């Protein structure tokens, strides 16, 4: 019952989707943020490639455009690692294709730099609106 936000961060990173659902049923803050770097459960689930967890967090009110101490959003992270279906779900839920990290880099820039050309094309088309 204690420290549910830290527990939710860990469960999201680790892919523990049943535990995510349990923690949220017991009141865990979907917008919990790491005390040192500001990352949220959605950041971790997007980076780590856990689509079900991404969808659970969005449905319970996670801020799709939350930023961490490096200016990274969940969309940056999914675009860098190269999770196309997560990119698509984040965009459908209002992810900001124009968001810049602390170095000026968009999710598109990270997709380009990581050889994720299919995602980069999705992001370029979304930036035209």
């Amino acid at each position: 019952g204690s420290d549910l936000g830290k527990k939710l961060l860990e469960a999201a990173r680790a892919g523990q989707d049943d535990e995510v659902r349990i923690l949220m049923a017991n009141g865990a803050d979907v917008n919990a943020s790491d005390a040192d770097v500001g990352a949220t459960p959605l950041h971790l689930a997007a980076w780590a490639g856990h689509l079900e967890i991404v969808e659970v967090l969005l449905k319970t009110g996670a801020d799709v455009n939350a930023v961490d101490i490096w200016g990274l959003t969940p969309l940056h992270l999914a675009a860098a690692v190269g999770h196309l279906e997560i990119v698509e779900v984040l965009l459908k839920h209002g992810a900001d294709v124009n968001a810049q990290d602390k170095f000026g880099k968009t999710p598109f820039d990270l997709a380009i730099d990581n050889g994720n050309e299919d995602i980069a094309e999705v992001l370029q088309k979304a930036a035209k609106l």
Partner: peptide, 15 residues
């Protein structure tokens, strides 16, 4: 570790 993400790798990596 292969993912090019910048200084934030210290928290996220992972790959």
């Amino acid at each position: 570790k292969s993912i090019r993400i910048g200084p934030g790798q210290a928290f996220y990596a992972x790959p």
